[PDB]
């Protein structure tokens, strides 16, 4: 159902010098959730219910979002996709996972879940993805809406943007939802970033990654890498597209729908569909893990 309850409470697990939350409830092999920018494990709240004795299930909120810690020093160069890449796999090893993995990713979390699995590939199960940062693009493959906002992100005007007038937290999430928010609702998601400045810094950092024109160069490698392996992975996949969606449409779609061993089904939603369909999608991701793990 819908609902604004999270789904338990954080347990926490030292990474590095800094305390990161995750959530964690029930026993077996691991369904691992990841969220994107500007949400946290709270996104999941709705839709892990469905797996409800289907496994070890796990929500993990990346580095200095959700209740994980800030990291300080913050500036310009904090909080780049490496950098959440070298605290998330260590997270991910002192879980504990073993190797039957069952992946659930969105946006960043895609781009983060796609990169830990070509490099983990005998550790993964199955994947489910929606409104992924599946492959490099172009503008043109941008949701036409937005596109002028995250060019203004990843120009000098992003600081006050996001740092001052919190705009990715305040605008682009709710208008990336088909349904409104409660006020709980968008506390939750408010929650970490209440504070102007550098604890906003991740919601800056996140669109200034997003691999574009070839830029960053950095992270257009390494999505070229885990596309290209998607592309040809025998690994089960269910794509959980989306209508009218965003990201995950046109060219990046049509790219996804050639990946194979894959199911299909398609919710209504625009970026953050998980507040829009969450029954919709955890039933379709149970059915996938009952398949994957025959009782
Ligand atoms: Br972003
Ligand atoms: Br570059
Ligand atoms: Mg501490
Ligand atoms: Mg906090
Ligand atoms: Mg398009």
């Keep these: 159902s819908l609902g ?13 010098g ?10 077996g092999d691991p369904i691992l959730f ?6 946290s494990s709270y996104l999941w709240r709705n839709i892990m219910p469905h797996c409800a004795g289907l496994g070890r299930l796990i929500a993990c909120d990346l580095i200095g ?5 800030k990291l ?3 500036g310009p160069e904090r909080y780049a996709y490496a950098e959440h890449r070298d605290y998330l796999d260590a997270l991910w090893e002192a879980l504990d996972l ?31 993805y929606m409104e992924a940062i599946a492959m490099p693009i172009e503008w043109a493959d941008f949701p036409e809406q937005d596109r002028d906002l995250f060019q203004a992100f990843r120009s000098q005007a992003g600081e006050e943007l996001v740092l001052q007038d919190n705009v990715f937290v305040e605008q682009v999430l709710p208008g990336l939802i088909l349904r409104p928010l409660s006020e709980a ?3 939750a998601y408010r929650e970490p970033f209440l504070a102007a400045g550098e604890a906003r810094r991740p919601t800056l950092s996140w669109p200034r990654q997003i691999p574009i024109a070839g830029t960053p160069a950095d992270v257009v490698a390494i999505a070229r890498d885990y596309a290209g392996w998607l592309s040809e992975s025998p690994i089960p996949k269910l794509f959980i597209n989306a209508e009218p969606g965003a990201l995950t449409t ?4 049509d790219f996804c729908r050639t990946w194979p061993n894959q199911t299909e089904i398609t919710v209504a939603g625009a970026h953050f569909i998980q507040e829009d369909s969450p029954d919709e999608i955890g039933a379709a991701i149970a059915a996938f893990v009952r398949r994957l793990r025959p009782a």
């Design 185 to 187: 609702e968008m506390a």
């Design 250 to 253: 046109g060219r990046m779609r």
């Design 4 to 16: 604004a309850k999270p789904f338990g409470e954080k347990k926490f697990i030292e990474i590095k």
């Design 65 to 69: 979002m959700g209740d994980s810690d």
């Design 98 to 128: 073993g190797d039957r993995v069952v992946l659930v990713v969105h946006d960043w979390g895609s781009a983060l879940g796609f990169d830990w699995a070509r490099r983990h590939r005998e550790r993964v199960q199955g994947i489910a």
């Design 18 to 27: 800094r305390r990161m939350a995750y959530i964690d409830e029930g026993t």
């Design 72 to 74: 300080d020093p913050s």
């Design 34 to 39: 990841q969220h994107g920018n500007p949400t």
